[PDB]
Write a protein that binds this DNA or RNA. Structure first.
Ligand code: K
Ligand code: K
Ligand code: MG
Ligand code: MG
Ligand code: MG
Lengths: 119, 252, 140, 126
RNA sequence: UUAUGCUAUCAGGUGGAUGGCUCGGCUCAAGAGCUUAUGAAGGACGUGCCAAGCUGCGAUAAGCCCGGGGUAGGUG
RNA sequence: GAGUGUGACAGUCACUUAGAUGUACGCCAAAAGACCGGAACAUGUCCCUGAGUACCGUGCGUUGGAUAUCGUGCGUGAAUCUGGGGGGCACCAACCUCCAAAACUAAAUACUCCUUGAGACCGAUAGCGAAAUAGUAGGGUGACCGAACGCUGAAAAGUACCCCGAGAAGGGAGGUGCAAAGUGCCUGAAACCUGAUAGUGAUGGAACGAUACGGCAUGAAAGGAUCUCUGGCAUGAAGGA
RNA sequence: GGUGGCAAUGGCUAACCUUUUAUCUGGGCAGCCGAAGCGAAAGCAACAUGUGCGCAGCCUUUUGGCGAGGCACGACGUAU
């Protein structure tokens, strides 16, 4: 969250850079699929470790996979199949920005998730 | 003299007699004075801090050491405090106590405003000013334009009036400017498209507010810089019936 | 000065670079030297040494606002239409007290019947008003 | 209109003055009337020395139906007893009212140029 | 095959200019405005698994407890 | 349709924005109740109403305060409503005006550690000294003086394996990456240094160039194509064999 | 000085209010300058043109005429 109090680039970027962890949770938002947006009433939700997303920007557009890991400080997620093979040849995950993906199936093992997504 | 009024569908549904503000001769010099004065009165004080480059106790070595006579640190040869020393004070910097405000007499400011209002009626000035339009100037709209509350209604009115092309020109002509202004917060160079003037505070202020390049104001809040952006008169403007009625002795 | 025009001139219109140093190049600070080397300049600019006369206290001294009979006469119709004067059987009745004037002076011509009431009149104002057919009334 | 005249014209900012100077020189040419070239040269002169003629001078120096051209402004100090036609750059409100009530006309330099291009009978007042 | 050199360009080294970027600075405006013997501010020393500085903290020592907000990660 | 982020320029990807919601402790707060109580007049050999005070003399400071500022050192020092003070020298008179020498009193004002916002501000030798492991490193016995240092990439994918090497250096080869951008790594100028190429060069004279004409080299693009070279013909000013 | 607004029935407002976040619009006559000078002061207080020359411009018989502004007088206010 950064209000229209400050339209200045420096203040916006300072707010994002020094965001608390509970504000960095909201930075993990991603677009919901049409079915999910219809059946939740909201347009977006935070990408969580476990839910299935489709990558829609970058070198891995079209891939569907489960979120392996989320970093709040980096603001990146790791998706099954989105990897960077290194000079060894071992496969390493390539971190993705959550705004570059779309949630197609939510992980709802947490009873608090529904109210977390809306309200 | 007289001007037709167009309903929301764009068809002329009557006549209005233009006030005496509209037959005022074209005075670009006075318009330039008024706009420059308003811009200057908007400006904000700035400058370096009080003792910037000067909070040292540096003193000169004098002659006999093979060095310039500039002040130096008491425990080093590093020069200090002088405008040609690194870290030294700015000679002649901007001062926060400088007064940038300009005065224009109320009579000649009103003359400039009247000249800019009359310039909204000349097609040559308006098209030369940059606007794209197909209407017949001046554009007087029936008062029901003031009661419409959504941007879509304004779009329908502007399309029926042949004015929406100017809004599209401002929207697609919005460009990221060159230089330091982007970091300071002026990322875009915006265009001006359409001025809507209303009789009083009405829903059309919010309804037309978000249109690209569009300004919506009332007759009370009408000044030279709205009618002559960048000191250039010939702004494409939509007047309402109430605005024309309220303009009878507005700046005379 | 136009700083841009002198970019490249070195001395910037000052003559020698040994000019433009301090108050020595002006002969001192302020209006100094008015008895010694700026004596003639002091005469020219009116700062010559000496005192003259005396001042009376502002609380007793007073100036009077004035208006000449020509000014009153040849814009009396405007005064009547603006309310500051009235026409009584053809004679303009002007009361200078509500105009802010306290002395009528006699410069100009009087062509109409002016009945003027004022704190004071010059003598010539008296004759000019009375020869025009009007009269002068003092303010008690 | 050589480089000096061009300097004076380029100096001016009021477009009415520029258009008047240009058209006055054109009319001095075409009509063969030095009155218009004279008015143009007076308008090219510095604006701080423009004519600001009061009604009293006009009344003092004019007769009935006397056509005056003032290369500047007519001011309203004084009285005007006889009708007089006055071509001026501008008028005061009081000057306009006085000239109108006296029976005279308050016309502009363009109007007087259109009324008689030769300038015959016109007397310049400063 | 003319060495030692001279002039111009090129390649490279050194160097850190220029450009572009900036979570910093500066100025102005609008707010808000006391605290400490119930021991303050400030300082010293300690405090981390691997931890030297800074920052935080005080032998309960990058921390402990309760309520609310937040919700899936966290470990300056 | 403020803006910022996101692999290049985003109203519709994310945070937002416009606009609505909610909020513990607190703060202000209207209706309605409880409480001490307020205001005029008549009468007057009546009572009370601020002392080293007001004033004054003299010295000094201060002031625009001038014989007419305020202060305070010394000295002196009242009156009591039939009274006292003031009205820019003193005193007399008239008129006008006030009641000191005891006390409190919101608001309008000032400021900027701090919070928010903004900016024709600066843009890393600038802007704070400090883009802060910055009042730090360092300097001074001390009072105190006081720096420099920003940037890989979209993603570490931060170079596997092999050869040389004493090597946990380095080099080669080979990879990663759109690009080495290869870790104080974006761009990467000049000075300076190494090498190459062109011209010149061990008989040679010095402001390092300007001008003209030649040798050698180059002359891809961005420069010419009745342009360049070489001639003929016509007309030809000054001049003129 | 150049360029402008308004103009003797003059010009402009200052603080401040109106800001709905510094702009802006509309107010704001307090005050300042101009409007009468001369004089230390008390004080007193002037030409809305009496004459001449004459530029531009206009008219003209091309030599003259009218002639704003300008110039030179005359008159007047006041101090001495
Ligand atoms: K994105
Ligand atoms: K962007
Ligand atoms: Mg938006
Ligand atoms: Mg610095
Ligand atoms: Mg600095």
């Amino acid at each position: 969250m950064i209000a229209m109090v400050s339209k200045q680039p420096r203040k916006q970027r300072k707010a994002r850079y020094a965001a608390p962890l509970h504000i960095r949770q909201k930075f993990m938002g991603a677009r919901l699929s049409e079915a999910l947006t219809k059946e939740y009433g909201t347009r977006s939700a935070a990408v969580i470790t476990g839910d299935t997303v489709k990558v829609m920007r970058g070198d891995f557009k079209g891939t569907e996979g489960k979120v392996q890991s989320v970093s709040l400080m980096d603001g990146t997620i790791t998706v099954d199949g989105v990897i960077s093979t290194k000079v060894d040849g071992t496969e390493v995950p390539r971190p993705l920005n959550p705004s570059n993906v779309m949630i197609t199936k939510l992980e709802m093992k947490d009873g608090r998730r529904a109210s977390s997504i809306k309200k | 003299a007289t001007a037709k009024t167009i309903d929301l569908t764009g068809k002329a549904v009557g006549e209005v007699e233009l006030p005496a503000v509209f037959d005022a001769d074209y005075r670009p010099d006075l318009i330039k004075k008024a706009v420059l004065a308003a811009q200057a009165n908007r400006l904000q004080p700035y400058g370096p801090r009080l003792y910037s480059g000067m909070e040292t106790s540096a003193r000169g070595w004098g002659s006999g050491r093979g060095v310039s006579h500039v002040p130096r640190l008491v425990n080093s040869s590093r020069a200090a405090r002088v405008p040609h020393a690194k870290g030294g004070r700015r000679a002649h910097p901007p001062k926060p106590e400088a007064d940038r405000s300009e005065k224009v007499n109320t009579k000649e400011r009103r003359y400039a405003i009247r000249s800019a209002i009359a310039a909204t009626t000349d097609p040559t000035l308006v098209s030369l000013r940059g606007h794209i339009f197909e209407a017949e100037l001046p554009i007087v709209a029936v008062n029901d334009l003031e009661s419409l509350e959504r941007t879509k209604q304004v779009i329908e009115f502007l399309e029926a009036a042949g004015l929406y092309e100017d809004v599209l020109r401002a929207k697609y002509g919005r460009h990221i400017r060159a230089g330091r202004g982007k970091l300071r917060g002026r990322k875009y160079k915006h265009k001006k498209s359409v001025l809507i003037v209303a009789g009083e505070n009405t829903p059309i202020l919010k309804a037309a507010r978000n249109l690209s390049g569009v300004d919506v104001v009332t007759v009370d809040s009408l000044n030279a810089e709205l009618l002559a952006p960048g000191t250039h008169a010939g702004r494409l403007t939509v007047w309402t019936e109430s605005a024309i009625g309220k303009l009878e002795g507005a700046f005379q | 000065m136009d700083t841009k025009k002198f970019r490249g001139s070195r001395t910037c219109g000052g003559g020698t670079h040994k000019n433009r140093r301090g108050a020595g190049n002006r002969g001192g600070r302020g209006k100094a030297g008015g008895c010694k080397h700026h004596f003639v300049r002091a005469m020219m600019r009116g700062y010559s040494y000496g005192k003259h006369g005396f001042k009376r206290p502002d609380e007793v001294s007073r100036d009077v606002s004035i208006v000449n009979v020509g000014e009153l006469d040849e814009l009396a119709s405007y005064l009547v239409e603006e309310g500051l004067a009235e026409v009584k059987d053809g004679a303009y009745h002007i009361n200078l007290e509500n105009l802010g004037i306290e002395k009528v002076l006699g410069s100009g011509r009087v062509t109409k019947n002016l009945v003027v009431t004022s704190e004071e009149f010059s003598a010539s104002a008296r004759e000019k008003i009375e020869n025009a057919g009007g009269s002068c009334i003092d303010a008690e | 209109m050589g480089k000096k005249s061009l300097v004076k014209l380029t100096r001016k900012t009021n477009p009415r003055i520029v258009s008047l100077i240009l058209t006055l020189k054109e009319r001095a040419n075409g009509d063969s009337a030095p009155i218009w070239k004279d008015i143009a040269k007076r308008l090219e002169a510095p604006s701080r020395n423009y004519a600001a003629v009061n009604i009293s001078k006009i009344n003092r120096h004019t007769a009935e139906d006397d056509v005056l051209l003032i290369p500047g402004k007519v001011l309203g100090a004084g009285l005007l007893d006889h009708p007089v036609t006055i071509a001026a750059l501008t008028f005061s409100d009081s000057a306009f009212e006085k000239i109108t009530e006296a029976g005279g006309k308050c016309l502009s330099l363009e109007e007087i140029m259109e009324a008689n291009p030769k300038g015959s009978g016109i007397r310049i007042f400063r």
